[PDB]
Design a protein around this ligand. Structure first.
Ligand SMILES: O=C[C@H](O)COP(=O)(O)O
Ligand SMILES: [Ca+2]
Ligand code: NA
Ligand code: NA
Ligand SMILES: [Zn+2]
Ligand SMILES: [Zn+2]
Lengths: 291, 282
């Protein structure tokens, strides 16, 4: 059922596994994510950016998820506001029915980040909603310790070297695992890895074969994702991988049959490829068979 | 809010205009249809085929429409099962919250088409749901009898489309004898700008030629009140999807594909609402 974010991540934290947090912007993405969770017996973090919420309407974003939760009532699901930029946005998400909100004030200085995070936390906890914040313009583990203690935030995204999107590394993949472990030891709460898409080889091949361009793309190696979870990561934000796999199949259908305009013929295969990315990621991170 | 199909079509029947019945398979199609209805101040018939229901799940098809109705509470909206093939299909749609169901037995002989339609009507009317049937070109006196015995709310008579040249005089006869709202199937009108968009994007239409706008106008003048529209929406939508794919091989943000696709679909709907005469009827 639809549950407070901390309910899923505290179990992940206690048992040391990672739960993918999968973005969606419409029905097809949402359905494939849920079918993956059903097929791998995995709890689900479903998240929506402010852009996705604008695109869908917050009423549709929450409404579709509630329909899917009723369709799969045995699956623990948290609905999470990804990269909330203001108190008011986090408050709107709470009022609408989100069960987790992220407030991203990591571009502010420490005191202003902590001040706004603490304000979001009070509002959210008053409503039974868990809260994520972010530290790292890389994270300072002693700042993280104080930040978590004073804010009462439920989970923290410490910056250890990732970034959003398909172009994460110009050199060798490198994540500061010693820093992650220090943060984990000093905070002892669930941690979040942003920018955690891997761009798997088969997703890349699918995309390029359909005529796409992924020049210079590099994701987090699978081994780095697994080492992140060993280091204490429990929420693993994933979006780019889903988009590439989905749009690869759309491009393919368009290439292979110029007369095709049944939307289902484009989006059924796209859903299948996205679903398969999620199922593999659930296994990799350790959330498979955790229901 | 959601209302019975017949409440929308009774008005169009009385006042002699046509209401587009617009198919959807997902959120993007549904949002664009609703925005068009909001922008043209037009009532909405929202249609879902059996294939679309299988694709979305009936719980999501109804659920999304209910959300959209609450977003635009002033717009009259009927949720219609398009080309239901069996009693059980129509009954499931009734139970899920559809406010209109169509049973297509037009491939059967008159006697068999009438008994099945009649069974669906009993069930649907018990639940407060309007019923469409189909009958084929049609013999107006058989249509007269069909409608009186079945008590169906609206009829799709075969009157010239190649489905499942407009026979205007036949259309008028059926209208006179049945005096109920009538439905036109298989009359998408691939507008010139939609055809150009699809081909400009590398699409292949070839042979698939739309029935002209004057055909739809004449049909409403003859008594057509519901105009099923689906093909035209898909072509406008996918034209823009193909276009984005062509023009940026690095683009994989779904919203970059589907926001222009929604706008193109929405504009097809707004134009059709004005063409059929449902604009400014709220
Ligand atoms: O919010 C972070 C996601 O990975 C990107 O989502 P967005 O592009 O919809 O903001
Ligand atoms: Ca940030
Ligand atoms: Na987040
Ligand atoms: Na129909
Ligand atoms: Zn982030
Ligand atoms: Zn038909």
């Amino acid at each position: 059922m639809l549950v407070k974010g901390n309910e899923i991540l505290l179990k992940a934290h206690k048992e040391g596994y990672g739960v993918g947090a999968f973005n969606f912007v419409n029905f097809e993405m949402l359905n494939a994510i849920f079918e993956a969770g059903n097929e791998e017996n995995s709890p689900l973090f479903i998240q929506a950016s402010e852009g996705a919420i604008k695109y869908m309407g917050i009423d549709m974003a929450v409404g579709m998820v509630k329909i899917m939760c009723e369709r799969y009532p045995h699956i623990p699901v948290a609905l999470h506001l990804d990269h909330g930029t203001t108190f008011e946005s986090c408050e709107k998400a709470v009022k609408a029915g989100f069960t987790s909100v992220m407030i991203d004030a990591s571009h502010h200085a420490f005191e202003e980040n902590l001040e706004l995070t603490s304000k979001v936390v009070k509002m959210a906890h008053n409503a039974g909603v868990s809260v994520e914040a972010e530290l790292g313009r890389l994270v300072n583990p002693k700042e993280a310790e104080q930040f978590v203690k004073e804010s009462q935030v439920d989970y923290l995204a410490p910056a250890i070297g990732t970034s959003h999107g398909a172009f994460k590394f110009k050199g060798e993949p490198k994540l500061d695992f010693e820093r992650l472990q220090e943060v984990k030891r000093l905070t002892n709460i669930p941690l979040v890895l942003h920018g955690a898409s891997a761009i798997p080889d088969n997703v890349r091949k699918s995309y390029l074969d359909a005529g796409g361009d992924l020049k210079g793309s590099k994701g987090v190696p699978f081994e780095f994702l697994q080492e992140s979870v060993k280091g204490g990561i429990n929420k693993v934000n994933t979006d780019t991988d889903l988009r590439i796999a989905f749009i690869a199949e759309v491009r393919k259908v368009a290439n292979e049959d110029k007369s095709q305009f049944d939307l289902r013929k484009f989006f059924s295969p796209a859903q299948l490829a996205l679903k398969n990315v999620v199922k593999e990621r659930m296994k990799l991170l350790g959330s498979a068979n955790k229901i």
